Amino acid sequence: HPNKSQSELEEMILAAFKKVPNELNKKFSYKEVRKLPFKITITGRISASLTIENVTDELKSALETKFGRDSTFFDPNRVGKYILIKKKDVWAFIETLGYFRDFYLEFVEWNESNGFYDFVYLDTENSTFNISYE
Amino acid sequence: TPTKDSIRAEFEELVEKDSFWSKFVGSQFVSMLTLFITQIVYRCFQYADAALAEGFISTATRRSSILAAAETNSYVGTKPTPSSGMIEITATSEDAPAVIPKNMPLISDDQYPYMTMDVCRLVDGTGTVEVAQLEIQEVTYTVTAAKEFLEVVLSKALTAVCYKLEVFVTTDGKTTQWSSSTMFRLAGSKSQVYVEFYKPSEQLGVRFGDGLIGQIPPEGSTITLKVWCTNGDITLVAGQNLTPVDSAANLANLISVKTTTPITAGTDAETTEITRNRAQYYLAYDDQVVWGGDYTYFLVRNIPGLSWVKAWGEGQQEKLDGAYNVQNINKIFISGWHPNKSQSELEEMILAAFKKVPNELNKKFSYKEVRKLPFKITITGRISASLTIENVTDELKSALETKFGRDSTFFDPNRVGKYILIKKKDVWAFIETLGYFRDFYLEFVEWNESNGFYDFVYLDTENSTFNISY
Amino acid sequence: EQLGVRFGDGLIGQIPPEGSTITLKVWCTNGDITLVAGQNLTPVDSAANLANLISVKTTTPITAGTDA
Amino acid sequence: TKTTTAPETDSKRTQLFLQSVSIGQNEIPREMIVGCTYVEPGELSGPQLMLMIRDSTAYVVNKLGVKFGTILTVSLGDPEGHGGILFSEEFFVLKAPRKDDTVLIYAFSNPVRLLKVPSTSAQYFVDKPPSAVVSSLAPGLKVNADSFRKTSTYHLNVGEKPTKVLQEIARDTGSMCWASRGMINFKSMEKMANAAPSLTYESANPNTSGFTISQFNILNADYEYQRRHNYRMASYDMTKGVVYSGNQEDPIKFTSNPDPTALANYNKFILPRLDMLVEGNAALTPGTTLKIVVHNTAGDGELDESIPDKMIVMSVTHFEDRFRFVSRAQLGVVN
Amino acid sequence: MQRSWFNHRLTSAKQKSLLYKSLADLVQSMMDTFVDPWLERITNRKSIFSMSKEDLETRTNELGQFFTIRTSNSSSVPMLLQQRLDEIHFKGTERPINQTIYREFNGISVLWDPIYAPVDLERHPYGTVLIPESTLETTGGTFGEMFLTSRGMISIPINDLITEEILRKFNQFVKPLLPLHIVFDGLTLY
Amino acid sequence: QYPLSRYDDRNIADPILRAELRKEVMLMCESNDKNLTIYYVLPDEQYRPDLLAYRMWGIAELRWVVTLAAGLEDESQGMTVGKKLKLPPATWIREMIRHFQYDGQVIGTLSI
């Protein structure tokens, strides 16, 4: 849950399941999530028309909105499905933005995550951006 | 950026603020009025937004608005050019055939017109001569009074099939040609000039000058407009019979057979988007060619089918290859690629085209041959297993070939003269946009950085290997 | 014998918003038809290929139909 | 060359159906025309026209020279009456006798006149789609078609009208043809039976929200038209043998084309049922579907069940004299 | 629209009824709030000096696909647009360079200096001795006659004021205006 | 179905192609032909072009001609009381709308 602890989530889920009649000879168990953030490094040119600081700020905000701990990427529709971030998505999303004439992405601390209890998301603040004029 | 919800909320707040509506009438009379008003206001806002978007040239969504904006910045698009070929058989049937005729009209098996460009041989056994699709037809307009501009507009059908246009003016038994001009830049008070223009409706017209900046067509004079008409793109394979028309006296005498090269060089007019780009650049182009991109723009306009062209001055060459050279002063270097023509032929065409270039003085032109680098990729991915592996491989191979191939349009997305290079991010985005792969990875093999002047980097689909599973 | 689609109420579904078009796409098939072998099939709509190609029935006949 | 000129400002008068008649850029005074009959048929027989012009001074034929080959510019419309439509067409004069200080002008529509000319040379279309044939035969009309499926071969011999090939295409495709108001129309017969009506015509109802029928004719002779189509088609194909199509209990009749799709559509047509006369509606064109309600005028106001609810228009005739504007229509049902 | 138009188009009897007048005012207020600004934006695009800022941004983006511009360098955006579109006509002369330098750099006046080279080529190589115009008459090099080269070098006064920033601004912004056969070599300061 | 009157300029669906018809109508309204009528704007017709259209021709859908001839863009701005207008008959404008609606070609186009 975006804004509450894991134990509180355990309590809510257990209570919600308890209210409805339960199945025969089955017991619920909860597994706490494990956080594995990843970071990126970008080198590129942005043309002399724009300003470096504004480009960096807009890039940080957009990336945090798209891939983030509180992002909606994991269920764009509230139907219950887990969707995992992959490498092609970052390239495509950065390409759709029109700032960069050229860029070369590199991934740091990337991990391969099972869809069951592994959490992978982006940490924008720690990531380093190298932007220089053409 | 209002939505229906914002409109409804604002209307509810306005109603609640009102002294009379909030107190005297409640909850039945108001509810349907709210829906009606919100729907109407949203519709009006959408229409106003559409009009505002269509206001400017860059954001236009209909052809007529683009044509009007192009007419504001005087721009006439390229006109269709005839397909050309060769007829090598004109052997007679009886006796006394046309020894050497010229510009004979022909029809070929589809009620489509052809004509011979040059005189034939005496045809001892056979004679060879080239034909084009051009046909001739004229229209005339008399002058009752001096209207000070006297614009003459052609019909839609005639403008659709139009290649050239010549203007003749006849007064008191003498006829002369009138040359065209770029606006009225240096002519006045006796020059015989005119300006072409394109109406928002698909009609081409000719505008004569004012009293001060031209000569008004005098009263009691006849103006003739001669149009060379051609259909855009047709091909005749070989062996079909071409029968003379009008000069039909030769049909019994002569036998004309299509042989050797097909009529295959046809071209149609521009699309809407290419017009949108070229009309925008024409503002900066004017008619002078001082800057770097002007040469490429002029070459692309004059030569059809060209893919890409780059021009660089002496400074770029001195940084690139040789430190210093006296010969490099006032030297212009050109490089290009033509899918259907060899490099020697392109060398022949470009220099001849540059003979008529504007602002030509104290300038020397040189051409440098292009060098090709094959490029290659390797992909590993997994399909959802709903679609077969082989079909996915074939479709991906074809799409990559048409997108990043040697004959692709990526190097010039629009026909405006420019050179665009291939970057790594472009492949990553393009392969994803198809959506075949759930997850894929790319590795680049035999890839080299391009100079941007004479390096060419296409993509080789045949050699690349695709690893697909799941 | 008519088949229909019912959209939901506001609480338990999303009412199709006003000023929208609903498209129903149906795959139609006759129930139990069999064509034995060696018969000719000619393209329609995409008929530009009829002069180009030839399509004939061979190998397995069509026999897997089922009615209601 | 031909120049497109603006209409003159001296024509301030508005009429019922016939608005103006001109020969080139000169106008015949409208008050001199005492008759007008415009016919729009349901097949490729083209729109027709007939004008009766009072000429006691010997002006129309003597000084204007009206004979074979005169092109009239006629403006027809009804911008104020029941149907506010307005259009312009060109007509080609075939003959114009003069009797009793009067001239009767017989005219044919020019775009269809060009289609009713015997061919000097033969044209054959081998393995061509019907669209190319239609475009090549009539390059001056807009094509409105929805019933083209396959490709075939067509032949036009010397001395035959181009309309014959178009009618053959219509028969092979199973559609209905009529050329009116600058278009040529191909509309399938199976989809016409499921079309919703656009107008409502009622009888013996004075509180109706639609229009009113003044006279109508009921035809009960359905065998008169079904007699000619009660046959079982057969033909010879070199690779299949003898090919049959149609019913099983009808007499056999031989044709030549061994095409199963063409054979299946050989016996489709529209069965006429009703003729009616209304008060001058200019929106009635062939291909229109109407809803008809008829009440009885004696006994107990019983509805007539012998007239179906939805009908299609087949032929339309408009007629204007010097006092009144009237229309006549023929209605039918798809078999 | 105006303050009381949709209300005033009612019959004299209906204007004195409270609810009808209130409804007319409500409808006019809604239309004024959500529809009117876009129509006013549409009608005000005729003249450059009357458009709003969003339309100016749209026009500058249209102009930016072919030149490299930054609107915050000059004092006014309409002046930038009008002067660039006007100096497009003076392609190749010194007027665009001089006026762009004056406009985009807060008022520095600059004059263009061509470079001269010795005619004696077998003793002096072409690119070893290059002299600007101001130092041409006051020098002792090349010991011979001279000619004009397709090279130029800018001269700037100190009082009207750093070199590195002026350089960078020049290569990014003004060099694109030069013809492709002209070579630019450094700065001169006096 | 809900059709349109034959006197409505909206019969041409593209706002840009309507410019030819508007230009022709405005050019006529400034000429001095013998079939023109002179009409002054009365004090009660300051904000109501519909009233002027009804009083002059008898047709109320011709208010766009009155708006165009006065030199305005919207109907919400008031016309100057006492401005002289010249207006052509209805048949001409009606056929002019039909012309650009159908032929669309410009008057004077040369054909073969």
* Best CA proximity match to B277, nearest among E45, F14, E66, E69: E66
**Contact in structure between B331 and B364 (CB atoms under 8 Å):** yes
Distance CA D289, CA D313 (A): 6
Q: What contacts D200, CB < 8 A, 6 or more positions away?
A: D208, D209, D210, D211, D290, D291, D293
Cα(B243)–Cα(B105) distance, integer angstroms? 9
Task: List Cβ neighbours of D58 (8 Å cut-off, separation of 6 or more).
Answer: none
Q: Do B332 and E180 touch (CB under 8 A)?
A: yes
- Record: contact B441-A94, CB cut-off 8 A: no
Identify the three-state secondary structure at position A58: helix
d(CA E71, CA E78): 10
Distance of CA A17 to the CA centre of its chain: 29
**Residues in chain E that come right before a backbone break, where C and next N are over 2.5 Å apart:** 161
Check: CB of residue D180 under 8 Å from CB of residue D40: yes
What is the rounded CA–CA span in Å between residue D78 and residue B456?
A: 68
* Exposed e or buried b per residue across B348-374, where buried means at least 16 C-beta atoms within 10 angstroms of its C-beta: ebbeeebeebeeeeeeebebeebeeeb
Distance CA(E108)–CA(E155), nearest Å, equals 11
CB pairs under 8 A between E and F: 8
- Obtained via which technique? cryo-EM
Q: How far is CA B269 from CA B155, B274, B401, C60, in A?
A: 17, 10, 26, 51
Q: What is the largest CA-CA distance in chain D?
A: 72
Distance CA(E13)–CA(E10), nearest Å, equals 8
Whole-number Å distance between alpha carbons of F54 and F58: 4
Structure token pair of residue B171: 């007064």
Assign A78 to helix, strand or coil: coil
Nearest residue, CB atoms, D149 vs list C45, C48, C51: C45
DSSP strand pairing (D199-203 vs D289-294)? parallel
Give the containing element (helix H, strand E) for B63: helix B63-72
SS3 content of chain C, % helix, strand, coil (to 5): 5, 5, 90
Nearest Cα residue in chain D from B152: D3
Chains that touch A (3 or more CB pairs under 8 A): B, E
Distance from C-alpha of A30 to C-alpha of A16, rounded to nearest angstrom? 14
Cβ contact (<8 Å) for F47 and E9? yes
Nearest to D112 by CA among D87, D83, D88, D141: D141
Chains A and B touch (3+ CB pairs under 8 A): yes
Q: How far is CA A37 from CA A49, A61, A68, F24, in A?
A: 34, 17, 9, 69
| Percentage helix, strand, coil for chain B under 3-state DSSP, each rounded to 5 | 30, 25, 45
**B residues 391-430 closer than 8 Å to E (CB):** none
Q: Compute the distance between CA of residue E55 and CA of residue E65 in angstroms, rounded to an integer.
A: 16
**Sign of the four-CA dihedral A25, A30, A31, A33:** positive
Widest distance between CA atoms in chain B: 108
Q: Are D89 and D181 in contact (CB under 8 A)?
A: yes
Query: CA nearest D153 in C: which residue?
Result: C51
What backbone torsions phi and psi does residue D114 show, to the nearest 5 degrees? Answer: -60, -25
CB contact under 8 A, D5 and F106: no
Q: How many residues does chain A have?
A: 134
Per the structure block, which two tokens stand in for D255? 């044709």
Structure tokens at B309: 């062209």
Q: Count CB-CB contacts under 10 A for residue D280.
A: 18
3-state secondary structure of E120: coil
- Please return the burial class of D69, using the count of CB atoms within 10 Å of its CB with bins 0-12, 13-18 and 19+: exposed
Nearest to C51 by CA among D88, D151, E10, F38: D151
Resolution, rounded to a tenth of an Å?
Answer: 3.2
Between chains, do A48 and E68 touch, taking CB under 8 Å as contact? yes
Please, what is the Cα angle at B366 between B362 and B370, to 5 degrees?
A: 155
Cα–Cα distance measured from residue F96 to residue B433, given in angstroms and rounded to the nearest whole number: 50
The CA-atom distances, in angstroms, between E163 and each of E107, E132, E170, E174, E175 are 16, 18, 11, 15, 16
Pairing of strands B465-469, B377-382: parallel
User: Around Cβ D163, how many Cβ atoms within 10 Å?
Assistant: 20
Contacts of C62 (CB under 8 A, 6+ apart): C33, C34, C35
Nearest CA-CA partner of B221 in B255, B273, B174, B153: B174
Q: How far apart (Å, rounded) are the C-alpha atoms in residues D105 and F39?
A: 44
Contact assessment for residue B305 and residue B265, using Cβ atoms and an 8 Å cutoff: no
Give the CA distances from residue D9 to residues B269, E80, F35, F90, in Å, rounded to whole numbers and listed in that order. 40, 51, 6, 10
A47: contact with E, CB 8 A cutoff: yes
Q: What is the largest CA-CA distance in chain A?
A: 69
Q: Is D129 helix (H, G, I), strand (E, B) or coil?
A: coil
Among residues B154, B149, B151, B126, the alpha carbon closest in space to that of B139 is found at B154
- With CA atoms as reference, report the closest residue to B197 among B217, B182, B187, B185: B182
**Distance from the E167 Cα atom to the nearest Cα atom in chain A, whole angstroms:** 14
- DSSP letter, residue B92: B
Q: Residues E79-112, buried b or exposed e (16+ Cβ, 10 A)? A: ebbebbeebbeebbeeebbeebbebbbeeeebee
Chains E and C touch (3+ CB pairs under 8 A): no
- What does the DSSP 8-state code read for residue E170? I
Q: Is B116 exposed, middle or buried (0-12, 13-18, 19+ CB in 10 A)?
A: buried
How far E185 CA lies from chain A's nearest CA (Å)? Answer: 20
Report how far apart the first and last C-alpha atoms of chain A are (Å, whole number): 43
In the numeric block, the tokens 């300003």 are attached to A51
Q: Report yes or no on chains F and E touching (3+ CB pairs under 8 A).
A: yes
Closest CA to B223 of B170, B179, B172: B170
Is the separation of the CB atoms in B309 and B377 below 8 Å? no
Which stretches within B174-230 are classed as H helix?
Answer: none
Q: How many CB atoms lie within 10 A of CB A87?
A: 16
Q: Which two tokens stand for residue A113?
A: 């995550």
Which alpha helices (H) appear in D30-89, and where do they start and end?
A: none
In chain F, which residues have their Cβ closer than 8 Å to the Cβ of B152? Answer: 108, 110
Give which of D204, A88, D73 is closest to B424, Cα–Cα: A88
Helices (H), B359-420: 389-404
Q: Locate the chain D residue with the closest alpha carbon to F108.
A: D4
Which B residues in the span 303-322 are in contact with E, Cβ-Cβ below 8 Å? Answer: 311-315, 318
Q: Which residues of chain B from 136 to 155 reach within 8 Å of chain D, CB to CB?
A: 139-141
Q: Backbone phi, then psi, for C53, in 5-degree steps? A: -115, 170
Smallest Cα distance from B240 to chain F, Å: 31
D97/D103 Cα distance (integer angstroms): 6
Other beta carbons less than 10 A from residue D21's beta carbon: 21
**F47 touching E (Cβ < 8 Å):** yes
Residue with tokens 């223009």: B197
Interacting residues of E43 by C-beta distance below 8 A, sequence separation 6+ = F73
The answer to whether the Cα torsion of A43, A49, A52, A58 is positive or negative is negative
Please judge whether B332 and E181 are an interchain contact, meaning their C-beta atoms are less than 8 angstroms apart.
yes
Question: Do F and C share at least 3 CB pairs under 8 Å?
Answer: no
| Cβ pair B152, B141 in contact under 8 A | yes
β-strand pairing of B105-107 with B113-116: antiparallel
Q: Angle at CA B371, nearest 5°, toward B370 and B377?
A: 130
Residue A68 structure tokens: 């983030």
Q: Which of B37, B43, B49, B45 is nearest to B10 (CA)?
A: B37
Residue D49 CB contacts under 8 Å (≥ 6 apart), including other chains: D36, D37, D38, D39, D74, D91, D105, D106, D107, D108, D109
Q: In whole angstroms, what is the distance from residue D309 CA to residue D290 CA? A: 8
- D307: its two tokens: 């007239």
What Å distances lie between residue C55 and C40, C43, D128, D264, E136, CA to CA? Answer: 6, 8, 19, 22, 88
Chain B residues with CB inside 8 Å of A104's CB? 424
D321 vs D34: CA distance, rounded Å: 6
Note whether D187 and D287 are within 8 A (CB): yes
User: For residue B27, how many other CB atoms are within 10 A of its CB?
Assistant: 6
Type of residue found at B339: P
**Residue given tokens 């023509």 in the structure block:** B341
Measured CA to CA, the distance from residue F86 to residue F88 in angstroms comes to 7
| Residue that has been written with the tokens 């006032």 in this structure | B330
Query: b/e map of E169-181 (b: 16 or more CB within 10 Å)?
Result: bbebbbeebbbbb
Phi, psi of B294 (to 5 degrees): -65, -40
Number of neighbouring beta carbons within 10 Å of residue B469: 9
Task: Quickly list H helices, B184-270.
Answer: 250-253
The DSSP bridge pattern shows strands D270-278 and D325-334 to be antiparallel
**Crossing angle of helices B29-55 and E36-43, rounded to 10°:** 20
CA distance A103 to A41: 10
Considering only CB atoms, which chain C residues are within 8 Å of D130? Answer: none
Rounded Cα distance, B454 and B333, in Å? 10
B111, D1: Cβ pair inside 8 Å?
no
CA–CA–CA angle D218, D224, D229 (5° rounding)? 130
Write the secondary structure of B278-333 as one string of H (helix), E (strand) and C (coil): HHHHHHHHCCCCCCHHHHHHHHHHHCCCCCEEEEECHHHHHHHCCCCCHHHCCEEE
Residue pair B300/B417 in contact by the 8 Å Cβ criterion: yes
Q: How much of chain F is in helix, strand and coil states, percent to nearest 5?
A: 45, 10, 45
Tell me whether E5 touches chain F (CB under 8 Å): yes
Counted residue by residue, chain B has a size of 470
